[PDB]
Design a protein around this ligand. Structure first.
Ligand code: MG
Ligand code: MG
Ligand code: MG
Ligand code: MG
Ligand code: MG
Lengths: 98, 127, 60, 24, 155, 206, 78
RNA sequence: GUUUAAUUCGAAGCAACGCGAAGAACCUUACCAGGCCUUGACAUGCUAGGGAACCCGGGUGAAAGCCUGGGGUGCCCCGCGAGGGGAGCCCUAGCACAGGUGCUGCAUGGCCGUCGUCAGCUCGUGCCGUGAGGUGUUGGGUUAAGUCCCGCAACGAGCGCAACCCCCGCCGUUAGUUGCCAGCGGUUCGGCCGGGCACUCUAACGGGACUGCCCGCGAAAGCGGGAGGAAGGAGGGGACGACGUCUGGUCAGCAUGGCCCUUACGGCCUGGGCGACACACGUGCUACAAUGCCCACUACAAAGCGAUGCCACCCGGCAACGGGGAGCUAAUCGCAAAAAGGUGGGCCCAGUUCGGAUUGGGGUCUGCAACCCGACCCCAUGAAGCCGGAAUCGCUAGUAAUCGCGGAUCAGCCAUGCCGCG
């Protein structure tokens, strides 16, 4: 039941993690509807290349934020053990909501 | 009991749904006859019927989703033909050669830095 | 006024009246972002470097 | 001076956020 | 615009009538990116000669067209060490495109308060040979065929 | 003068960041704040060992810092009176889960800065530029490399002019993605002043 | 536009209200400007700076909503 | 340019002039004027007095600054005790000092522009020449291209074009808190619900387009095609910018040599200035109107953003807005109403129910504080403007024009400029 999203600026670190979470329950308890890809959120920053007069010639950067979601349909008292056990993830943050 | 069509042009979305009816063609309710009251391309949205001599025949549920008005029409001029072919597939050689079964994608150009409307560079002053 | 102005941007003296920004490494006045705390300069010379997580170079 | 200190003219040059705009 | 000779765009024909020529004109009156707002003028004008007489608004359209398409015309071209002008015939496609832009620009000049009035008149007045679009047409030929003597370039 | 930052062009692919953590909305700078001085602390304290890289592992509260140096025998201390007291004396500004690593180096002369580090160190001492790079861009290629390029510029010989230099053998396709090329950022405060020692080291493909 | 509430600088009332315990004099040398022309003070003369000097003026009934900083011109061109 | 006391500095055809500025009310600020501070606004180290630290206040003084007061009194070497000492921190004195947007971009590092997205820059072997060197890269043709072909005493390669990266055109799967009666069951007939994942949409990996095939043409690359295919010959945009010139731009983003300033060329405050105006240019903004302009009614977005913030909604307000407060730390909540569009009435060519500059009075709206130097709104005042000379500007496709929607610095503040979206 309990709710978690997955937020990472890189899908590779996020999808894998999203694929990683599924292991700690879908192969520990009942089936889980796979990850739910939210529309990716961006933080679109374009900056003038030059340090002085050349106002044009700018260059663009993005701090993309890839959001994905996973919902378990039967919170199993043993699978949740397998969750916190996975203390080897990556540089990605996640939250748990009820 | 029906056939579905997809129609996307100019990032517009217009779900197309053909049924074998008689004369009901509306859009999200409203009424295609009068949703689009006051147009010019209005007849052009239903073309793959008189070109197949079959307007007084089938019926169509219509759902649009956002997109540009002409892009909402020009996409309908697809999902019609982008349907039917499932169980009505012989509807081809009097269409593709004449030239309907294509998206005619013409997506806009993005604005770019150091310019204005994407391609109009500012005034140029050698002086 | 290099090492003389950033120090002012700390004590917070007069009312919400002189509350402005200041880049960290570059210490530059304007062109500073509230997200990175970096001038448009003191950001690139770390962005292209890579000390700016997720800050790739855009492309679209 | 369109959008500055002490006139009344026009604000398509000064903006409005934080200016006098609703916050909380 | 030097090497390969480009591609002429092919246009979307009309819906009402069955001819590209019709659309070839409605897009021409179109201003400010306002498309439907133009076909009114045209088709409001069409729905006048239907009431004016037993003249169909299309089967007549083309006659003033062939009364606005000229034959031979000039062209400015640099030779020797100064500037003169050279005549020639007229490209048929250009002959067509030259006609339309001639036609529309004759509208706003006509003293007519409304809209389609400015359209049909220069059309109709050129259906027999007494229209502005005819004057500016022949004037070129008047400025051209008067230069028959330039028989060496010509090509 | 063109050719923007090769790594800055890499970055979002191939070689991943010199750090690694998501950050929230208003806590980004709050973490970046003390994240940078971590690097800035060592780029003149840990130097006499050849520094080329410093990761940063975070996610929440706990921070794992990994260093990439070639000569660890001096940063580790006679038995720990360095590497284990550098950690404890690192929390003093950031009370965080004091963590550390030291990744070995099997072939130093293959990392782009280490060269440029070695060059400037060699440039500072009154040494022959053109013939301190020729030896360098050769011993790079010698160490199993397959391409290199090391450009310097400044007051060569202290003369009033300022011509750059060259020292390269092979291929350095900067404009290609899969190339995987590290890039060296050096600096040389000297008698006459400030230099600019760069370096490209091609490596492989795919 | 002076909304619900008007103002005038602090030490001004220090430098202008003591001028009325006996309805006192006129001489003054201060440093404020953005203040509001005080309807309760149309009976003195006020030292108002411009950039290099203080240039005053006798206050007159009509002067109310305007500011003390207008009677002291700054950009010497006119 | 002109001037004021200051109108800080830089930028100088193409490469400056809606440029450093994506923050000139004070500070930002670098400028002027005045007031004041001098081991400081900062960092490291030493000596001495008081003291730990740290909170609070007053008089005056424009502020800063100056003088003063109440408290309070920690951590380690002893001693319970009257009482010796020390690390840190603070104030006052001597210092070592730092500090400067001061100067030189012609002394530099780094970063940027131009040529220029031009298509060139070269190497290994061989050959020709005493040799420097040439050839290869030249000739014909073709292309966006040194792209490629033929020939050629040359044959191959490296940097560069391309391509490997990103967004769109098509589709497959995965997955369903947006969406869906496309099929059904309640409906205040709303996707509100039960319910379901094709469809909508979303974001990860993938197939797909390679002149592949065929009818012809030029031997050759290539070309007119055509079929299939979504697209066909680069499908359409992004980012990527070689050797090198411009002794190019930047000591003012930063670092830094050297000269200088150190009782100030350092530092703090109030006010004033870069908005000053007989002028002229640059870039933009509304127009000078019937495809036109107002009023009322009636639909469609794409992207972007936001908890100590976004603001529905209720009332009040003839209006910017005020009090209350739903939801939303975010595909949910909101900013948010989009304009051109469609219907219907007016205005029937007028200097106009076209345009809003100026200006009088009157308001709410943020912050110590709105005259020079804010909006929005009301009663108006309603100027030139009737299409613009010599010239000159961008633009080859969803481009040009037109119509509108966001973001980025922020207590407020230079945001009609910029960067994105439709
Ligand atoms: Mg990449
Ligand atoms: Mg298609
Ligand atoms: Mg230069
Ligand atoms: Mg207007
Ligand atoms: Mg209103």
């Amino acid at each position: 039941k309990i709710r978690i999203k997955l937020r990472g600026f890189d899908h590779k670190t996020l999808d894998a993690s999203a694929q990683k979470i599924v292991e700690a329950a879908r192969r520990s308890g009942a089936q889980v509807s796979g990850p739910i890809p939210l529309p990716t959120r961006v933080r679109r920053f374009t900056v003038i290349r030059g340090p002085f007069k050349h106002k044009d010639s700018r260059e663009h950067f993005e701090l993309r934020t890839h959001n994905r979601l996973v919902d378990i349909i039967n919170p199993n008292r043993k699978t949740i053990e397998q969750l916190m056990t996975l203390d080897l993830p990556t540089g990605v943050e996640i939250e748990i909501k009820t | 009991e029906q056939y579905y069509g997809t129609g996307r042009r100019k990032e517009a979305v217009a779900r197309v749904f053909l049924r074998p009816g008689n004369g009901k063609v509306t859009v999200n309710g409203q009424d295609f006859n009068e949703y689009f009251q006051g147009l010019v391309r209005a007849v052009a949205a239903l073309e793959p019927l008189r070109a197949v001599d079959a307007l007084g025949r089938f019926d169509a549920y219509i759902t649009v989703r956002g997109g540009g008005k002409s892009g909402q029409i020009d996409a309908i001029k697809l999902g019609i033909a982008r349907a039917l072919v499932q169980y009505n597939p012989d509807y081809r050689a009097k269409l593709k050669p004449l030239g309907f079964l294509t998206r005619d994608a013409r997506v806009v150009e993005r604005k770019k830095y150091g310019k204005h409307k994407a391609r109009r560079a500012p005034q140029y002053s050698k002086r | 006024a290099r090492k003389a102005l950033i120090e002012k941007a700390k004590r917070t003296p007069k009312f919400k009246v002189r509350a402005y920004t200041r880049c960290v490494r570059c210490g530059r006045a304007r062109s500073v972002y509230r997200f990175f705390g970096l001038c448009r300069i003191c950001l690139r010379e770390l962005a292209h470097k890579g000390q700016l997580p997720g800050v790739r170079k855009a492309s679209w | 001076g369109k959008g500055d200190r002490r006139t009344r003219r026009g604000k398509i040059w000064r903006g409005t956020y934080g200016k006098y705009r609703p916050r909380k | 615009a030097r090497r390969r000779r480009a591609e002429v765009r092919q246009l979307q024909p009309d819906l009402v009538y069955g001819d590209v020529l019709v659309t070839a004109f409605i897009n021409k009156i179109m201003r400010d990116g306002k498309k439907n707002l133009a076909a009114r003028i045209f088709y409001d004008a069409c729905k006048i000669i239907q009431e004016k007489t037993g003249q169909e608004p299309l089967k007549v359209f083309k006659q003033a067209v062939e009364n606005v398409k000229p034959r031979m015309e000039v062209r400015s071209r640099r030779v020797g060490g100064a500037n003169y002008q050279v005549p020639m015939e007229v490209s048929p496609r250009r002959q067509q495109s030259l006609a339309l832009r001639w036609l529309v620009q004759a509208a706003n000049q006509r003293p007519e308060r409304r809209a389609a009035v400015r359209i049909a008149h220069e059309l109709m007045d050129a259906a027999e040979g007494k229209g502005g679009a005819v004057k500016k047409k022949e004037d070129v030929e008047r400025m051209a065929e008067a230069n028959r003597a330039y028989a060496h370039y010509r090509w | 003068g063109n050719k923007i930052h090769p790594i800055g062009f890499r970055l979002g692919i191939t070689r991943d960041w010199e750090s690694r953590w998501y950050a929230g909305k208003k806590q980004y700078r709050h973490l970046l704040l003390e994240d940078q001085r971590i690097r800035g602390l060592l780029e003149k304290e840990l130097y006499s060992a050849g520094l080329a890289r410093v990761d940063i592992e975070r996610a929440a509260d706990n921070v794992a810092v990994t260093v990439h140096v070639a000569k660890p025998g001096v940063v580790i201390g006679r038995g720990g009176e360095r590497i284990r007291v550098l950690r404890e004396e690192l929390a003093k500004l950031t009370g965080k889960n004091v963590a550390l690593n030291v990744q070995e180096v099997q072939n130093p002369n293959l990392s782009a800065p280490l060269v440029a580090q070695r060059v400037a160190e060699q440039i500072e001492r009154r040494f022959a530029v053109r013939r301190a790079i020729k030896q360098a861009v050769q011993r790079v290629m010698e160490s199993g490399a397959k391409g290199a390029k090391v450009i310097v510029s400044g007051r060569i010989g202290g003369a009033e002019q300022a011509r750059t230099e060259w020292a390269a053998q092979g291929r350095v396709p900067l404009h290609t993605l899969r190339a995987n090329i590290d890039y060296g950022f050096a600096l040389a405060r000297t008698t006459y002043g400030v230099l600019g020692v760069k370096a490209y080291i091609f490596l492989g493909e795919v | 536009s002076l909304k619900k509430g008007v103002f005038v600088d602090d030490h001004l009332l220090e430098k202008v209200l003591e001028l009325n315990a006996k309805g006192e004099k006129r001489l003054i040398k201060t440093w404020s400007r953005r203040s509001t022309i005080v309807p309760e003070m149309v009976g003195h003369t006020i030292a108002v700076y411009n950039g290099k000097q203080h240039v005053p003026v006798y206050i007159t009934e009509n002067m109310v909503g305007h500011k003390l900083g207008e009677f002291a011109p700054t950009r010497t061109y006119r």
